[PDB]
Design a protein around this nucleic acid. Structure first.
Ligand SMILES: [Mn+2]
Ligand SMILES: [Mn+2]
Lengths: 261, 261
DNA sequence: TCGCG
DNA sequence: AATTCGCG
DNA sequence: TCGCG
DNA sequence: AATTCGCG
């Protein structure tokens, strides 16, 4: 849209970049916009880093590790800035998940199910895995006021509108987006506390209850509601939106070099 | 141990109760100890309940639901008390997870792996599912100061000490508890912020950072380190320990009926 | 190799 | 990765 | 039946 | 449920 990020976007659409390769393009574009700031991209972050990050908040936290070389590699990597104190502040982390062959299966006439008679396939629950990494990066950033975690969904198990796929013998299949036989979207809505789905939830909500005030860290959860695949341009533009917001909340610690380099 | 909870314990060991049936025995024993209080046990709690619970903290929270009849059934159920305001306060919620056939496979001479040559089986990552329900019940209790979630682990993928299993041709297998080829324990340590494993982490830690003070909700994560199965008595005694702590933190709202009934 | 996915 | 199916 | 596991 | 295996 805004000028130069339109060229980058068309570039992503032109090659159908996976989320990893788009995440690097966000590093690219960001560095064209903020040439005073220093961005790094990495494909891993490891439990020692998280642990020490935790310990720096409380001396009783982050004291565990069973497999020494333990890491987590979000399939979208991690983008970072260096702040005015040389520390590195994570601007983005993204992951991509698939679930629900149903549209392809219907499209090709292949009937599924134990006895080969099922038009649809009883939705499984693997997508609950997505919660661990979210817990990790949310712990990693337990001292930040922003949580730039974007999870990208697609597949028949994540429909947000009602679609009818037509199997080879001319027959259509009414696919009811709100069926528990299909839709697994609710398996994720714990991550952003039941706030909007396709939405920038990067800046943390500071809710309260008693004297007990608390901070909330909400993963931004995006979907391709029509069951189709993601436009590499749109994926990029979202990721750019999240990361700029991430920088906006970090602006206290990015003033000096942005105004003196 | 303490008198009557020893009889209940021997009862659980005598029939090798699954965690569900033990969770009901905790309701049993608790009601023998607190006959003024009113305990309920249920096998489900549903997303509408969670959502409304969320909304009662912030009018922007808990506004999502795709499959109407959406529930979550922790395999250990939910135990509750009625407080002085007729409201129900969850005293316990427990789940049981398995991973790692390796000990049984070695024990029976069955070599695994794509080409039938592997003594061990490359550990998979399904146990990351455990994080969703934890996020759910942690959201459900976002207004409490206690989080009585107990997760029970067992299997070769959750060893905490070093064990050697002996395959039928007299051969032993050194099983290295800290191998990433085996141990998946680190896949869970995000849930209790890297605090102790076999430990009552029910009372919430109130850590801080800036002016921003925050509350933490740590699942209590127990293991059978030697790869063996759980003693139904020990499972029960832990669950009892957690729930009594849960009551201790609830004692403001349990005074009147405990002293007037 | 280890370990994440 | 992310699936297939079982249980109510 | 729907939906969780 | 919770698995098998692929990728570095
Ligand atoms: Mn992925
Ligand atoms: Mn279970």
């Amino acid at each position: 849209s805004q000028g130069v990020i339109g060229i980058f976007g068309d570039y992503a659409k032109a090659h159908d970049l996976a989320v990893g390769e788009v995440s690097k393009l966000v590093k690219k574009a960001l560095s064209n916009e903020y040439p005073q700031l220093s961005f790094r991209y990495r494909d891993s972050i490891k439990k020692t880093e998280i642990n020490e990050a935790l310990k720096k908040i409380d001396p009783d936290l982050g004291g565990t590790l069973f497999v020494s070389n333990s890491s987590i590699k979000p399939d979208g990597g991690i983008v970072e800035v260096k702040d005015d104190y040389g520390e590195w502040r994570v601007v983005l982390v993204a992951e991509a998940k698939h679930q629900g062959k149903d549209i392809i299966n219907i499209r090709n006439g292949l009937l599924v199910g134990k006895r080969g008679d099922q038009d649809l396939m009883a939705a499984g629950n693997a997508i609950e895995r997505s919660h661990k990494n979210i817990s990790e990066i949310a712990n990693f950033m337990l001292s930040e006021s922003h949580f730039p975690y974007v999870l990208f969904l697609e597949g028949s198990n994540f429909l947000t509108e009602n679609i009818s796929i037509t199997r080879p013998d001319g027959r259509v299949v009414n696919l009811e987006y709100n069926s528990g036989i299909l839709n697994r979207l609710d398996r994720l809505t714990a991550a952003n506390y039941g706030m909007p789905i396709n939405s920038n939830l990067c800046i943390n909500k500071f809710v309260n209850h008693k004297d007990k005030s608390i901070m909330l860290q909400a993963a931004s959860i995006y979907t391709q509601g029509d069951g189709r695949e993601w436009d590499s341009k749109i994926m990029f533009e979202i990721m750019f939106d999240i990361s700029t917001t991430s920088l906006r909340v970090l602006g206290r610690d990015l003033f000096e070099q942005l105004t003196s380099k």
